């Protein structure tokens with residue numbers, strides 16, 4: 345009787361789910377149990393006639409293709425982005441904006457968006473003349489690979505969770521998922537944020553402040569920025585969670601810097617364990633990337649993101665206080 | 670090697686629009702891409718400039734040429750050789766004299782050589798609609814063109830194939846980026862935006878005191894090279910009619926073989942791919958009117974009047990195909 349796990353999963357609609365605890369309690373299956381919970385919570389198995397055993401088989405297969413020896417880009421991160429997207433989809437300002445297929449696409453994209461990540465950056469893969477960068481012509485190398493793996497796994501035995509979608513539903517979902525995962529490439533962050541800003545400046549809402557998004561171009565942009573916000577949500581979580589994410593990304597960066605040092609490569613910024621300032625890097629990350637993004641998101645869904653933005657600002661203040669004068 | 674004498678004579682035409690490329694394919698033992706690339710590299714002194722060992726060049730070209738499908742009617746080594754030679758002529762246009770660097774010239778020619786390698790003879794849309802491994806690998810986005818680049822670059826790593834072994838690291842990095850930008854621009858889903866941008870450049874074009882195009886940033890330079898190789902890829906209707914008609918015969922065979930695969934699957938046969946219900950001549954007139962002439966009249970504007978004879982041939986060939994309809 346793993347009662348504690350079911351207790352933890354009752355917070356699946358809350359920012360700040362104890363995802364490391366869930367990873368522990370589920371036998372390192374946070375992506376499987378959290379995806380399954382969210383699918384039940386959104387009635388997605390009945391809406392898209394997904395057989396429960398096919399869902400569980402695909403989810404375990406997918407989760408198996410996240411590397412257990414990568415400190416950050418692993419199945420716990422995938423589960424975290426899934427659950428974060430699931431909460432952002434319920435923003436009151438986005439009520440009635442997205443179809444069931446759009447909701448399914450955003451959640452599936454979040455689950456697969458880093459699958460088979462090797463724990464090094466696109467630039468490292470390009471600079472080492474990797475087989476991945478040769479395959480993908482140096483362009484969104486990892487993100488194209490995550491998509492290819494995520495979709496390829498649906499072809500394994502009893503893994504096609506979309507088997508009862510119509511032909512046209514499958515084509516539409518595939519296009520949306522590709523557009524969403526490719527937008528998680530940080531080389532696209534600035535263009536994405538500029539478009540989110542444009543939308544905020546021209547946003548149409550109801551009298552009760554709910555966004556009105558009529559064309560696909562605008563809806564997919566909001567979905568791209570939503571999953572991007574979820575991918576960049578660690579500094580907006582309660583500090584005890586955030587500090588664990590910082591420990592993990594820094595371990596991954598340092599392992600990349602050790603591969604670089606050994607090859608005699610230039611050690612990438614923040615990747616040198618002998619010359620790193622973890623706390624200054626987090627404050628810079630918040631000041632130049634995370635807070636501009638989440639402040640713009642909060643304007644789009646004004647005022648529903650205020651608690652999230654409050655947490656980010658508290659955490660920035662705390663990390664800054666750990667830097668001595 | 671009377672045959673070798675005849676081949677050498679034919680290769681004296683490598684600077685001319687209308688080279689007898691099908692004859693060269695036969696005379697060279699089905700090595701048109703190898704012999705035309707080698708001729709062009711010698712003509713432009715590229716082996717000396719980039720310290721390319723001649724045996725490495727031939728080894729790579731032969732391997733690249735082998736990775737074109739000898740059993741595909743249109744997208745084979747003869748098409749690659751033709752696009753290479755057509756780009757080589759376009760690079761020599763008076764309006765571009767001394768404009769491009771040796772590395773940019775190398776990039777345009779190499780891109781043309783690899784730009785369709787390992788083409789299976791079916792379209793991107795067919796590969797997407799049939800859930801192919803290629804479309805799965807490339808997320809339905811420029812599926813073939815990404816594959817052609819990955820193959821063309823990967824083959825440089827085979828034994829004695831690295832023709833760029835003596836470039837600097839900065840040269841190799843620059844060449845790789847330019848080649849990717851050029852081959853990705855041969856995806857027809859990019860044609861309309863590529864043409865729109867070329868028109869904008871023509872409308873705003875600056876010429877130097879010597880009368881050549883002024884291109885003073887990467888964006889403009891790569892855009893011209895992208896459209897140049899796209900024009901070469903879309904050059905069949907601008908060639909002498911006896912060449913053009915052979916290219917039409919070949920693309921229609923390839924289309925019909927695709928539509929037969931779509932028939933043997935219950936799919937809606939793609940337009941122009943139904944050998945039981947095609948109009949070859951109407952399709953060429955449509956191709957020229959909606960794609961090839963809008964492109965080439967704009968290229969002709971950019972380099973005016975350098976390409977006037979090419980444009981005149983295109984317009985004559987359009988009239989000829991039109992005359993076969995009534």
Ligand SMILES: CCOc1cc([C@@H](CS(C)(=O)=O)N2C(=O)c3cccc(NC(C)=O)c3C2=O)ccc1OC
Nearest residue numbers: 465528530575578589590593597612613625626629
């Ligand atoms: C101080 C950075 O902190 C974090 C960074 C990240 C991730 C998000 S991503 C979607 O994987 O790119 N991230 C960046 O945003 C980023 C920008 C530039 C370079 C860079 N990588 C290297 C190897 O240089 C990264 C990087 O890996 C996640 C969590 C973090 O802190 C908890």
Ligand SMILES: CCOc1cc([C@@H](CS(C)(=O)=O)N2C(=O)c3cccc(NC(C)=O)c3C2=O)ccc1OC
Nearest residue numbers: 792855857902905916917920924939940952953956
């Ligand atoms: C009447 C068309 O004639 C020709 C077409 C082509 C080629 C050039 S490409 C760079 O390979 O795309 N081409 C198109 O431009 C085109 C547009 C849309 C669909 C299409 N394919 C299918 C299966 O529908 C094609 C197509 O294969 C080359 C030579 C041709 O005539 C000599």
Ligand SMILES: [Mg+2]
Nearest residue numbers: 457458486528
């Ligand atoms: Mg990622």
Ligand SMILES: [Mg+2]
Nearest residue numbers: 735737738739
């Ligand atoms: Mg072959």
Ligand SMILES: [Mg+2]
Nearest residue numbers: 784785813855
């Ligand atoms: Mg092509």
Ligand SMILES: [Zn+2]
Nearest residue numbers: 421457458575
């Ligand atoms: Zn991620």
Ligand SMILES: [Zn+2]
Nearest residue numbers: 748784785902
């Ligand atoms: Zn071609």
